[PDB]
Design an enzyme around this catalytic site. Sequence first.
Site, PDB file in Angstrom:
ATOM      1  N   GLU C  49      55.732  18.802  35.030  1.00 27.10           N
ATOM      2  CA  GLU C  49      56.583  17.679  34.525  1.00 27.10           C
ATOM      3  C   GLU C  49      55.558  16.621  34.043  1.00 27.10           C
ATOM      4  O   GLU C  49      54.592  16.350  34.802  1.00 27.10           O
ATOM      5  CB  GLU C  49      57.491  17.140  35.696  1.00 27.10           C
ATOM      6  CG  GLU C  49      58.662  18.039  36.070  1.00 27.10           C
ATOM      7  CD  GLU C  49      59.622  18.207  34.823  1.00 27.10           C
ATOM      8  OE1 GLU C  49      59.758  17.146  34.156  1.00 27.10           O
ATOM      9  OE2 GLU C  49      60.102  19.317  34.571  1.00 27.10           O
ATOM     10  N   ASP C  60      60.354   3.986  38.481  1.00 29.62           N
ATOM     11  CA  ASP C  60      59.215   4.539  39.095  1.00 29.62           C
ATOM     12  C   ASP C  60      58.594   3.590  40.168  1.00 29.62           C
ATOM     13  O   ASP C  60      58.654   2.333  39.913  1.00 29.62           O
ATOM     14  CB  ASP C  60      58.125   4.731  38.011  1.00 29.62           C
ATOM     15  CG  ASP C  60      58.252   6.093  37.330  1.00 29.62           C
ATOM     16  OD1 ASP C  60      58.050   7.212  38.054  1.00 29.62           O
ATOM     17  OD2 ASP C  60      58.555   6.032  36.133  1.00 29.62           O
ATOM     18  N   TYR C 175      67.507  18.449  38.888  1.00 26.76           N
ATOM     19  CA  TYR C 175      66.578  17.661  39.655  1.00 26.76           C
ATOM     20  C   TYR C 175      67.296  17.148  40.832  1.00 26.76           C
ATOM     21  O   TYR C 175      68.153  16.248  40.719  1.00 26.76           O
ATOM     22  CB  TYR C 175      66.048  16.538  38.770  1.00 26.76           C
ATOM     23  CG  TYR C 175      64.752  15.878  39.301  1.00 26.76           C
ATOM     24  CD1 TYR C 175      64.848  15.250  40.543  1.00 26.76           C
ATOM     25  CD2 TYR C 175      63.551  15.840  38.564  1.00 26.76           C
ATOM     26  CE1 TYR C 175      63.781  14.553  41.067  1.00 26.76           C
ATOM     27  CE2 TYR C 175      62.535  15.205  39.093  1.00 26.76           C
ATOM     28  CZ  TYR C 175      62.636  14.622  40.348  1.00 26.76           C
ATOM     29  OH  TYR C 175      61.588  13.940  40.937  1.00 26.76           O
TER      30      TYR C 175
END
Lengths: 390, 390, 255, 255
Positions: C49, C60, C175
């Site tokens: 990824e 993030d 995911y």
Amino acid sequence: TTLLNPYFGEFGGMYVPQILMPALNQLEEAFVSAQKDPEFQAQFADLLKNYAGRPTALTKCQNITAGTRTTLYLKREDLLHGGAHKTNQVLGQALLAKRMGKSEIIAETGAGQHGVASALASALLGLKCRIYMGAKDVERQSPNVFRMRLMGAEVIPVHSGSATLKDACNEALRDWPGSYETAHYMLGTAAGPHPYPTIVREFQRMIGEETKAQILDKEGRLPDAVIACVGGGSNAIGMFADFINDTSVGLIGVEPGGHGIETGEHGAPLKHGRVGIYFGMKAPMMQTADGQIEESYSISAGLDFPSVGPQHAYLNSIGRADYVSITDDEALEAFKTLCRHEGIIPALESSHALAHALKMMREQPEKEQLLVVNLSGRGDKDIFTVHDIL
Amino acid sequence: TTLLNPYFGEFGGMYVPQILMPALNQLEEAFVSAQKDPEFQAQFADLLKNYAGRPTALTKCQNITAGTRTTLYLKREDLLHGGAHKTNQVLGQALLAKRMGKSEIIAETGAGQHGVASALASALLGLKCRIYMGAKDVERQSPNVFRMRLMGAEVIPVHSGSATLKDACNEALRDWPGSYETAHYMLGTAAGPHPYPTIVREFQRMIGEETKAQILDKEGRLPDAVIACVGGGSNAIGMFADFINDTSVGLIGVEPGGHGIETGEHGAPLKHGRVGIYFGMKAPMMQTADGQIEESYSISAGLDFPSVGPQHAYLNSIGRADYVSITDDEALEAFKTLCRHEGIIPALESSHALAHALKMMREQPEKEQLLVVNLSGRGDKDIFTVHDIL
Amino acid sequence: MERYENLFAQLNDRREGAFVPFVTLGDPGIEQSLKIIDTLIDAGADALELGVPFSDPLADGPTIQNANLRAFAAGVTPAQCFEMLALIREKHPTIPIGLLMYANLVFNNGIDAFYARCEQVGVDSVLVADVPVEESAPFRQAALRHNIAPIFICPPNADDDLLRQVASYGRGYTYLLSPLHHLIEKLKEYHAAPALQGFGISSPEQVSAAVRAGAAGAISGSAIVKIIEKNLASPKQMLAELRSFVSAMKAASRA
Amino acid sequence: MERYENLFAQLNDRREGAFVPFVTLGDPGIEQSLKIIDTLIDAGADALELGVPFSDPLADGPTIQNANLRAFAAGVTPAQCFEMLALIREKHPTIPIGLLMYANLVFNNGIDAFYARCEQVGVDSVLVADVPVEESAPFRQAALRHNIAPIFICPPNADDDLLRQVASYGRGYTYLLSPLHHLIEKLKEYHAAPALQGFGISSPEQVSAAVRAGAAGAISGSAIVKIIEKNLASPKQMLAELRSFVSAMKAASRA
Ligand SMILES: *Cc1c(COP(=O)(O)O)cnc(C)c1O
Ligand SMILES: *Cc1c(COP(=O)(O)O)cnc(C)c1O
Ligand code: NA
Ligand code: NA
């Protein structure tokens, strides 16, 4: 799936990580409940009257307009508790947090005024408030950081990225998915993901509602235009909303032109940026050619949000509102002019809206026109920026 | 010979040089005319509503009083245009100057707030304003000196004597005998020679008139006491006047106790000074044993007038009002406490009145009492005095 | 291409889970990034990824925030990342390569052109971090027209309607953001793309654990990016410690 | 005592005006002040007006403001000024001596005690600068009980009622603050105390002019105090230039 439309034409939406959707849908549903709940409306009106000082005056300014056919009124948000219009919607959001049973408030802020607003509302309403602020803005907004701390809020510097307002916006959006159960995110303008553009408009629409009642009492007709500065869009949409369906009333928003739109050093993404997707929404953004988000430049630190609320990009696209820009030196002239001829010190953000009204008057001095400027805040905070430059 | 009584019992009078008497008698006669003239009353009310933002809110403070039988309201003069109550009476005096055909305004000021008030009113009303300020206070009140200049006033430093407020008071009284034909002296508190104690009371009495209407609406009865700080006496007499004949209502004035009355470093001449004659009046003064006038000390720069208005010394002598003192550290605690529990930043002058209400509540927490504090001003101006000390 | 379908068949033939590392392209510079990536593959990564540095990576935490800081300190741009991707594909034809993108970089100069660029360089999937399923229709449709798998995150508390939509809309892998036993079985029930567990995976026992719970594998990024962060002034130490970590993590995935 | 009545009779016997200098007691210190005063008398002053330093002399311009600054820099107090006055009276028994006071120094510790102290040391008159006729009753009555003349200022524009009141209430002299022809004749009409013109008198021709207009004389202070101010680091030059000025001014007053 939502209760209310998250877009204004192409603009708006809910571009957040999946894990944040339940927090937005919960806030939407609480807000549609509270808007119908007469008890929530009477608790919000009582705080806005007896705590914040609503209604605020509408002041005619006959010394500025002498020798012309312009009549100018200023809607006095500078007299609101806190010194700017941001108090109105923080009080509403704080009561929405409590109605959802939350005990904690997350806010972002740039020049510090939304942080102070959110910290005052959290002190009054017994919420625990933490604020994110870019570390370059903590360093340059000593007085607001201190106010916040006096009022019991936790100020958390953000050192990532450019260490300014957009970096604090990202940090709020990183904390909320782990805290939305007990913390509400009190966003500071009419932008971000739905439902925030719609909640902040509704919690600022008393600006324009009062202005319409006040101008009909004093002149017997509506304004030819209402004029407001546009950082993220809250004070302007709160002045514009009650006039959107009065088609003869012009709606003029003023973005900061900084050192001038040709220099590139400005904060005018609605008319000079490109549509992008960031902070939860599709809207015009300050961004590079390759799509990195950039900061807005203005002498006024409070016009630093690097995009704009989606309802203004929509009201521009259909032609219902018009958006212009005013440079740092026009804003400074309008601040000096109001101080000397009306004894009112305006915030430099609001000075951009006054500057554009002065150009409408000066450019056509024999045009008969009735103008209202929303004087979004007081300018005691700016007097030495204005000193040091002059 | 006068139209109105220049004394309050033994206190007051007109102790000026002979050459100044005609200026006082002319101002007295203009004022008795304007008080009967309905046009002057409607021009003053329209400025106080649409320019200055009257009426100001009366805010209940339930977080400060929890767990006690005190109910406390704050009369919100901090929300008045300019940030303090001084705006009300400057507007009235400015309209009295114009009714006498004067074109120029003389004012004195110490911490700068009366100078700013007088400069805003002179800018709005097209008067040419000059202000006297002790040079040690010009040096320490940079932000107010700049505001004044932005508003078009001439700030004249006074270097004589102690170069503080009383020295600027003397300089105004030296300029007026050569200028009273075209200049009015806009005195800054309810003191000085007649007619000033009476004119400033009448032009501040809307504080208490509004407070009585507001507390009867909200609680259905009058307060057990109204509490106000006392520098020269204007905000307190403007809160007290409409209650003097309501004999059950306590009137408590709070003088600054500085580092403590035993240290001698205070500003509490009503209860700890001696009667003298200076600035035009017989009243309690800060003075030496041999009769030299001295300065008042307080952490709040605005409680620096070294005497007190004669109507407070009279209301003390007959027992109608009671006067107390609060030290610098009690005022600082009350400022911190309002910031953190109600999200309101109070001026340090007004913090002395809040401190005394807090001691009435804390000393007797099960006494049922309804208290109003006059919150004479906002405290953004004090936040780094408060910073630097803590 | 069907690189993920090929991979998960191969790894099912061996009763093995996938181990998929994440790195930011260009961190700490293009040349060292391209060696880091080649080291990950040689040490056993089953798929990659890869992040394109963005100014405001609002989903993030600090380790990846700082990876993007480092890549921008090197002048990395999205066009230089697509040159890198074409190079990495020409060295390595079968490993699946997924991008983790922020929306504005895909929408920038047009969503169908961004997915056409992906298809030209040999990218297999794209996860856009700030596009929830509710906003995904132009992204997923453009991804499918250019034979790119649109990846969605299934949050830990995903209600049934959200499970059914991730099932229907995703391809490649799901995911599963990090007792997943119920969300894993529900995903299989709805015929979702196979699940890779992600967030927090930093040790071998978790790799084992995600495969035992029924996931097809696990993704790790901050742990790989902290090794870069720790070893910046010794590029050769950096490669060796990345090799040691990946080899360990992939061994945990074997039956 | 009737020192002023004695003086003005003597000066009428010689068709002469009075010349009356003003100084601040104690400026620039007690000993130099006492020599300045003795120099004024020897050079021809007919009477003296003497200031007691006060912290806030709101009727005085900069020259006297600064005289009071200098006296306070020397530690001068009102009790030290009354010691000075007793000394000056014991050297000089007939010259009239007037004080210029501010109210608070007379009211301080009691108005009748202040005028009794005056009478004990040999002061002849007191002008209180900030007591207008309207506030004067306790001052004038106490002055008269202790055989002190209360002095009032007649302003340049004084209306008829004010002329009649200054006439009635004053003794000693009338201070006519500086075409006085009408206010002078009106004062005589009402039998006022004889007029001394004051403010601004700094040259001989004005002394002559005030006497010709009908005044009994003239007072000068700032001009005398500027000579002190100019000569501080040469005390002997100071005395000589004070002597030269006063002798000139008094010669202008002679017929
Ligand atoms: C923050 C601020 C602004 C800009 O924000 P908007 O959301 O565009 O209203 C404008 N005026 C004042 C005084 C501000 O504090
Ligand atoms: C000046 C000032 C005071 C003191 O003056 P008063 O005449 O005694 O009222 C009190 N509060 C504020 C906020 C002031 O600015
Ligand atoms: Na903007
Ligand atoms: Na005082």
